[PDB]
Design goal:
Elements (H helix, E strand, L loop, with lengths): L1 E7 L9 H12 L4 E9 L11 H19 L6 E4 L2 H11 L2 E7 L4 H16 L3 E5 L7 H7 L8 H8 L24 H4 L10 H4 L15 H12 L2 H5 L19 H6 L4 H14 L10 H16 L22 H8 L6 H13 L4 H14 L5 H11 L5 H11 L26 H6 L8 H4 L7 H6 L15 H21 L1
Parallel strand pairs: 1-2, 1-4, 2-3, 4-5
Helix pairs in contact: 3-4, 5-13, 13-18, 17-18
This protein binds flavin-adenine dinucleotide.
């Protein structure tokens, strides 16, 4: 008896999962011949390559638990194998007598390299490998092909391309396993009956004092519930315009499906299909780029440009990316990273980010502009790294692509438009409720100076119980001065890049 193995990496879901569905149908179309091992590999190598904060670890933990629960309902389970894939797969290929391995493809350079090696090993041991592109709606390879070998570098060309492509068929959940015994314990399982059980919170989250509120639980089950909840107001969905949603409302002004889409707890293909059903129902509706479908297309856009550039997450060696002489300032980087810039709107966002692991798209704009072309002139790579650690939705292509946009390094070139760290939040939160919540030391400042506490006299600062320089920092830079200087620095960088 040989085993069929589905390997979760992303695609942490039962629904719309062709790679996992094929495994299951095969076992049921040929009962008694196959064992089924759905596995997730706790790969220590990924930590040399990316940062993971406490909040995102918990999200993964919760996700793996939900996925194990969901597989049990199909007379299966999740096997979480600890170790490096390069060492894990030769062992289990033999110990398990693996006939077929399936997994969902990923375009990230660490994923491509790792997957190539696994496919070289699988070819050697005579293991059949079947891969499916289901993490994105469109296959980036086919978009680039249709565009004659190059990724479209504007959203509108990208839309023009994918319009002519076939939308894939969205699958349901696999059928339960008919009369399948629990696989026999292997070398590892026999010396430890729990060697493959889902990790506890204690095993994954080493810095539990960095956990923030538990607001967006991981898991396919929570993903589907949040999607349904978000789709209930079809008028809100149909008339969604991303630029007009507030960055600093106390409740999220958008869907917060990003962590789920990032891990594949939600199929982007399913979400897209559900969105197109409402749009059909609702004749007055928004259109890309501002619409909710437009939002999913932004995800497709960045995956397509990223798939063509292994150096997408850095300035050097990146075909898309303007070469800009960013400066090194460790103290300013530290202040931004910990929301101690002295600009309450910026600090509010960076603190919501650290504590909760999600901030609105335009709040990411605000803090990203400030770090880079706007105020501090620090590389977008440094902001990417902080975002990587704290974001629940940390996504290799989307984090890099949007940082390049916000820094005017790629895709966006109107660097003379600079967010004000004082004015920008006021449009949608003139009372500063968002600042009061995340910078509570300023909570007694009136709306007239809560965005600009340095406009309050010392007497009033003492009266509000928050003296600048003691209880809340002084501004680390003066926006009105530096952002004018940085526009000149940007223009010089643009000139140098144009001449080369
Ligand atoms: C500096 C910076 C860094 C970012 N890093 C990430 C990241 O690491 N991971 C991430 O998922 N998004 C990232 N984004 C994009 C965007 O801000 C988030 O996708 C969005 O805030 C998610 O919130 P939401 O799910 O409520 O989005 P909604 O507006 O409800 O959109 C639905 C989905 O569309 C996609 N989407 C929406 N906006 C964008 C966008 N601008 N680019 C790409 N896809 C988009 C996401 O999958 C999102 O879940 C970043 C943006 C900026 C400016």
């Amino acid at each position: 008896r040989s085993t069929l193995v589905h390997w979760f990496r992303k695609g942490l879901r039962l629904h719309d999962n062709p790679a996992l569905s094929h495994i299951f149908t095969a076992a049921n179309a040929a009962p008694g011949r196959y064992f089924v091992r759905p596995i997730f590999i706790l790969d220590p190598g990924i930590l040399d390559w990316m940062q993971v904060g406490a909040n995102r670890w918990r999200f993964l933990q919760q996700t793996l638990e939900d996925l194990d629960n969901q597989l049990r309902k199909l007379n299966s389970r999740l096997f979480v194998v600890r170790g490096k894939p390069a060492e894990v797969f030769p062992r289990i290929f033999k110990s398990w007598r693996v006939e077929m391995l399936t997994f969902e493809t990923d375009i990230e350079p660490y994923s491509v390299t790792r997957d190539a090696a696994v496919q070289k090993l699988a070819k050697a041991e005579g293991v059949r490998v079947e891969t499916h592109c289901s993490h994105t709606i469109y296959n980036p390879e086919l978009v680039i092909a249709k565009n004659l070998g190059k990724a479209p570098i504007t959203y509108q060309k990208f839309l023009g391309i994918v319009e002519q492509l076939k939308v894939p068929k969205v699958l349901g959940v696999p059928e339960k396993l008919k009369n399948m015994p629990t696989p026999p314990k292997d070398e590892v399982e026999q010396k430890d009956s729990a060697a493959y059980d889902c990790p506890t919170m204690k095993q994954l989250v080493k810095r539990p004092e960095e956990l923030g509120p538990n607001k967006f639980p991981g898991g396919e089950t929570e993903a589907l519930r949040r999607m349904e909840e978000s789709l209930k107001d079809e008028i809100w969905v149909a008339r969604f315009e991303k630029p007009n949603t507030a960055p600093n409302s106390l409740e999220p002004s958008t869907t917060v499906l990003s962590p789920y889409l990032k891990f594949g707890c939600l199929s982007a293909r399913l979400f897209n299909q559900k969105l197109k059903e409402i749009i059909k129902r609702q004749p007055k509706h928004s259109q890309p780029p501002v619409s909710l479908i437009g939002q999913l297309m932004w995800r497709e856009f960045y995956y397509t440009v990223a798939a063509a550039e292994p150096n997408f997450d850095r300035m050097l060696g990146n075909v898309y990316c303007m070469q800009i002489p960013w400066q090194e300032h460790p103290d300013h980087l530290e202040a931004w990273t910990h929301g101690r810039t002295g600009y309450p709107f910026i600090d509010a966002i960076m603190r919501q980010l650290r504590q909760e692991g999600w901030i609105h798209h335009l709040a990411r704009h605000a803090v990203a502009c400030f770090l880079t072309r706007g105020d501090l002139w620090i590389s977008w790579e440094e902001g990417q790294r902080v975002f990587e650690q704290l974001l629940l939705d940390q996504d290799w292509a989307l984090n890099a692509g949007n940082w390049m946009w916000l820094s005017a390094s790629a895709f966006f070139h109107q660097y003379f438009r600079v967010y004000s760290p004082v004015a920008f939040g006021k449009k949608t939160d003139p009372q500063g409720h968002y600042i009061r919540k995340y910078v509570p030391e300023l909570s007694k400042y009136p709306a007239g100076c809560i965005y600009e506490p340095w406009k309050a006299s010392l007497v009033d600062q003492r009266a509000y119980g928050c003296v600048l320089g003691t209880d809340y920092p002084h501004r680390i830079v003066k926006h009105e001065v530096v952002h004018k200087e940085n526009i000149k620095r940007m223009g010089a960088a643009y000139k140098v890049n144009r001449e080369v």
